[PDB]
Amino acid sequence: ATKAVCVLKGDGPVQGIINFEQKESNGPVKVWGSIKGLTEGLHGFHVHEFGDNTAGCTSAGPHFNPLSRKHGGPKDEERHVGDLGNVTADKDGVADVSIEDSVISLSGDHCITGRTLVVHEKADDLGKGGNEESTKTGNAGSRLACGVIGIAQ
Amino acid sequence: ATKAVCVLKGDGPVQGIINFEQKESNGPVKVWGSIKGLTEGLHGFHVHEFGDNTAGCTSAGPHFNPLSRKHGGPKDEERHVGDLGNVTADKDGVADVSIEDSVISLSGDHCITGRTLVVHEKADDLGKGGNEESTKTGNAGSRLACGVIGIAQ
Ligand SMILES: NCCc1ccc(O)c(O)c1
Ligand SMILES: [Cu+2]
Ligand SMILES: [Cu+2]
Ligand SMILES: [Zn+2]
Ligand SMILES: [Zn+2]
């Protein structure tokens, strides 16, 4: 198996740890871990193009989109490679993450390693919000925490 | 042609930004930037194997060593791929980094993206120290600051 990991940090209280595992080349990737310090509800959760945190999470650029598609949810055909939907926090501010995704990879042109995972201020509308920005960013707002996805042991 | 970046964070603040550029996949990599908050003198400067910062810089593991060689300096044939020698700080606590290296790469089997860059407590003896640890770590000591190397715009 191939493994990767991301430590999420930002300027405020949001912090988390996310693990990735891919049993087979071109097979699905399991994504799991925890994020704390969040407001209750949905928070957009995406891989962004650049693994650049120079000036904070903004430096990571747009959603990772090697196929030049429109934004969607993880269960949509029309999506960016980086579109992992939302994490959902309870009243304690904790989101338990447990995702399987077949579009991201840990090798090849869909590889997310060396790119940035971001958790956002607001819900991602999964491209169903009915404005122009819905099919670009999902209207998920600012970036609360992020980290560069690294190769794991 | 291909670019990467690393934000180094550790206590001091030991902080730094390091940029990487490779004009072609078969070519050398320029490494440049600044690190501040350092004690005057040499500090070992290496790419480590894993891009895992789960528990801090320790999680990054040993020097990146895809060819299973012994530790050396960047000019040596016998080196780890991740052996970038030392950065040298003045009394002002700043090291200016300007390295060109032909062994690291931003593609292929020697690709350093997704791995951790580390600045160390003490000097790297470039494998010339005459104890066993010299040929593994260069006797560079603890890990002051680190970051995961990411794909840049
Ligand atoms: N059922 C084990 C969870 C799991 C682990 C690795 C994977 O690649 C995956 O798709 C799912
Ligand atoms: Cu995002
Ligand atoms: Cu090191
Ligand atoms: Zn998207
Ligand atoms: Zn070494």
Cα distance between residue B88 and residue A82, in whole Å: 39
Tell if the CB–CB gap between A153 and B49 is shorter than 8 Å.
Answer: yes
Residue nearest to atom 3 of ligand 1 (CA): A30
Instruction: Using the mean position of ligand 1's atoms as its centre, give its distance from the Cα of residue A9 in Å.
Output: 26
Torsion of CA B136, B141, B142, B146, to 10 degrees: -60
Residue B58 carries which DSSP code? G
Domain that holds residue A122: 1-153
Amino acid at B51: G
What residues pair up with B44 in beta bridges, in sequence order?
A: B86
Please report the DSSP string for B93-110 in residue order: S-EEEEEEESS-BSSSTT
Upper half-sphere CA count for residue A20 (Cβ side, 13 Å)? 31
Instruction: Using the mean position of ligand 2's atoms as its centre, give its distance from the Cα of residue B109 in Å.
Output: 29
Please report the DSSP string for A98-128 in residue order: EEEESS-BSSGGGB-TTSEEEEESS---TT-
As given in the structure block, the two tokens for residue A20 are 């990735």
As given in the structure block, the two tokens for residue B14 are 């030991």
Cα distance between residue A74 and residue A138, in whole Å: 12
Instruction: Using the mean position of ligand 1's atoms as its centre, give its distance from the Cα of residue B142 in Å.
Output: 35
Q: Indicate which residue of A79, A110, A115, A143 is catalytic.
A: A143
Domain count for chain A: 1
Q: Which residues from A are below 8 Å from B8, CB to CB?
A: none
Tell if the CB–CB gap between A52 and B150 is shorter than 8 Å.
Answer: yes
Nearest to B88 by CA among B77, B80, B99: B99
What residues pair up with B150 in beta bridges, in sequence order?
A: B5
Residue A110 annotated as catalytic = no
Choose among A54, A148, A153: nearest Cβ to B148.
A148
Question: A22 in ligand 1 pocket by Cβ < 6 Å?
Answer: yes
What is the CATH classification number for the domain harbouring A13?
2.60.40.200
Tell me chain B's radius of gyration from C-alpha atoms.
14
